[PDB]
Amino acid sequence: NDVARGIVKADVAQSSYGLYGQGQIVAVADTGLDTGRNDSSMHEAFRGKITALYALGRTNNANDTNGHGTHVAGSVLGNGSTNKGMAPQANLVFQSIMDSGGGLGGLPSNLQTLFSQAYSAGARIHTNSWGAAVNGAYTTDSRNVDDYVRKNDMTILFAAGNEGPNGGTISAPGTAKNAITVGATENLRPSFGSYADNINHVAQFSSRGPTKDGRIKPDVMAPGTFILSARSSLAPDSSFWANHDSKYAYMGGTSMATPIVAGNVAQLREHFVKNRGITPKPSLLKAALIAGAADIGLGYPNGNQGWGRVTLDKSLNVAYVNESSSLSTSQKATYSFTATAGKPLKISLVWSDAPASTTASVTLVNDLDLVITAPNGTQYVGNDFTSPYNDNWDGRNNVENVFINAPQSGTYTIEVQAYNVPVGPQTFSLAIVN
Ligand SMILES: [Ca+2]
Ligand SMILES: [Ca+2]
Ligand SMILES: [Ca+2]
């Protein structure tokens, strides 16, 4: 966590912007949380900061004999004396879904039940280091994630899965359109060897897109190898990659990358609410993370890194549109942005789409297109990264991007065009970095 904090710029968010996640509540659905008791027995990283601790998988037992859940929650918001999570003043809703057999039987059949329970408790961010390895398929769980986000103010994150490095290995519900799906790059702890020596390396195991219908997943990356975070007092050494001390130990997986991003979302949401005067919609938090992300060196579009590695300080300050307009087929919204040529210009359009059928061959329901015009007339179409940049149109993704490394100083025109919106009108968010 301490090195991940610096890689994703949560250190700048904390030290220069004051963002530790205070006032935000993150829900984690995972194995269990240390002793399973919201009292003074609880691990120092969560003692006193638990909004609610629910036992779903084992009636009346939310403890963590595995370790996964405690480490995950630790990375979101742990506030112990060392190895703090990214949002260490956020409060925690924890849903313990591990069943007596070690499986995830506490999950309800309809995942909307899980998310609504968390929402009722006050959580507005819900993070899930779990999934089924269904090679990019959009399942009932994916559908319910999508329906839930379109109807409720909840940012939902899912791990991409650990079936890399082959293409097309994204887990469900990480295949949901409206979640933020997170893959793992390496942490920088090179004494532990090749899994933690290059922050621009995709971890070998991280699942890779595209999804079954060709969409780019994961959406973003974060460090997910040799992450030092909270150690359940009931977990054995075999659950960890390496020991550290009685309260903290190492783990790696997309399960570790996801909660780093979830804590960054708490920091970002705090910033919008306290410092920018608005409650940012899930689509805007997602767009802002995407526009701020760093190309780890593979270029775009790319299923190995998605849109790149979270870089939180760039996301804090984006120019935005927060679902303030909705579009039906053939309509367009227009914005103008004055750019400066010193720095890259990155524009990200994200929408919380209508849920797809589990039987559809193409999951995108409502298709918006991003079209940008430079001061000197050059046009760019969302996700067209091959010159000429206005000839390849996107009909699959509900994230569209125009990234220009050396922009012209001057006013750029930004159009969001409703190509085909059968379940309309469709709103959207934009985030702009320059
Ligand atoms: Ca490496
Ligand atoms: Ca499109
Ligand atoms: Ca092209």
Side-chain angles (χ1 to χ4, degrees):
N1 287 345
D2 291 344
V3 178
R5 171 181 179 270
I7 292 166
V8 300
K9 305 286 285 257
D11 57 342
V12 174
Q14 286 173 16
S15 296
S16 299
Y17 299 75
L19 303 162
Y20 301 83
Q22 190 285 335
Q24 301 293 312
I25 300 170
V26 183
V28 177
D30 213 303
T31 54
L33 194 68
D34 190 41
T35 59
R37 309 169 75 77
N38 190 0
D39 62 19
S40 70
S41 74
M42 174 61 61
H43 188 293
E44 61 175 30
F46 318 101
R47 202 157 56 237
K49 71 149 65 278
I50 296 162
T51 298
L53 177 53
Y54 295 140
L56 284 53
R58 291 155 292 151
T59 308
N60 306 329
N61 178 6
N63 77 9
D64 194 14
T65 51
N66 172 294
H68 184 272
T70 301
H71 193 278
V72 169
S75 288
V76 179
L77 47 57
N79 191 38
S81 314
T82 54
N83 305 308
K84 292 185 187 290
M86 304 301 96
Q89 294 286 136
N91 279 337
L92 177 61
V93 168
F94 189 106
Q95 289 163 307
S96 171
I97 55 178
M98 186 175 60
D99 61 55
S100 292
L104 293 187
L107 288 166
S109 182
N110 185 333
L111 290 179
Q112 305 199 43
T113 299
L114 183 76
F115 308 132
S116 42
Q117 178 181 53
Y119 194 97
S120 292
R124 300 286 184 272
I125 303 160
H126 195 283
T127 186
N128 300 274
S129 293
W130 55 263
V134 287
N135 279 330
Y138 188 94
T139 62
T140 298
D141 281 349
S142 301
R143 173 185 175 74
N144 279 314
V145 171
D146 277 358
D147 192 38
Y148 193 84
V149 174
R150 180 176 187 92
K151 293 164 327 172
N152 304 270
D153 192 46
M154 179 80 97
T155 296
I156 305 184
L157 301 92
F158 274 93
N162 302 319
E163 304 293 333
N166 187 36
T169 48
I170 304 293
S171 286
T175 55
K177 295 175 287 180
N178 292 346
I180 303 176
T181 302
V182 180
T185 45
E186 296 184 355
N187 207 12
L188 191 58
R189 294 185 176 280
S191 64
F192 289 98
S194 64
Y195 265 133
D197 65 352
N198 188 333
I199 69 168
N200 287 308
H201 281 178
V202 181
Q204 189 172 60
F205 52 82
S206 190
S207 287
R208 317 300 178 88
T211 62
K212 183 166 171 204
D213 65 341
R215 293 174 292 129
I216 302 300
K217 289 285 195 175
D219 296 296
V220 296
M221 313 294 280
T225 66
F226 285 102
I227 300 291
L228 174 56
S229 189
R231 173 179 185 135
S232 173
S233 66
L234 304 180
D237 283 3
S238 55
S239 287
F240 300 94
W241 280 22
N243 291 340
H244 173 83
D245 72 10
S246 61
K247 287 183 185 154
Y248 301 90
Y250 287 94
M251 287 188 172
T254 55
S255 292
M256 280 70 252
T258 300
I260 292 301
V261 181
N264 296 150
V265 174
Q267 295 178 280
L268 181 62
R269 193 172 190 279
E270 176 191 16
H271 185 59
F272 275 107
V273 168
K274 288 189 182 167
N275 299 134
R276 307 200 61 183
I278 62 156
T279 297
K281 295 287 182 187
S283 57
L284 177 52
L285 289 167
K286 181 169 175 181
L289 287 181
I290 289 168
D295 178 354
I296 73 180
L298 304 180
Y300 300 120
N302 193 282
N304 300 296
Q305 69 159 328
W307 303 114
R309 190 183 58 244
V310 168
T311 304
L312 179 57
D313 56 350
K314 292 198 176 166
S315 301
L316 298 175
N317 298 301
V318 295
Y320 67 87
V321 172
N322 191 35
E323 297 190 0
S324 51
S325 289
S326 69
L327 296 168
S328 287
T329 300
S330 80
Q331 297 181 320
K332 72 173 75 292
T334 307
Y335 312 89
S336 295
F337 181 77
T338 306
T340 58
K343 353 155 221 185
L345 170 64
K346 297 183 66 178
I347 304 152
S348 299
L349 165 71
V350 175
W351 54 107
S352 296
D353 195 22
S357 154
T358 57
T359 46
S361 68
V362 168
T363 67
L364 192 70
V365 171
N366 298 323
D367 183 4
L368 306 182
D369 295 329
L370 179 65
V371 176
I372 308 300
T373 313
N376 68 359
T378 302
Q379 283 214 326
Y380 306 77
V381 165
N383 297 340
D384 189 342
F385 290 87
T386 53
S387 188
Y389 296 115
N390 68 338
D391 59 7
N392 299 115
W393 299 77
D394 190 303
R396 285 295 181 279
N397 290 295
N398 56 310
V399 180
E400 279 202 14
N401 298 292
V402 170
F403 300 161
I404 301 161
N405 283 348
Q408 301 149 38
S409 273
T411 298
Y412 281 74
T413 301
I414 305 171
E415 296 170 50
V416 178
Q417 304 188 342
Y419 178 71
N420 187 4
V421 178
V423 185
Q426 170 72 62
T427 188
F428 60 91
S429 294
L430 286 165
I432 302 157
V433 171
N434 183 218

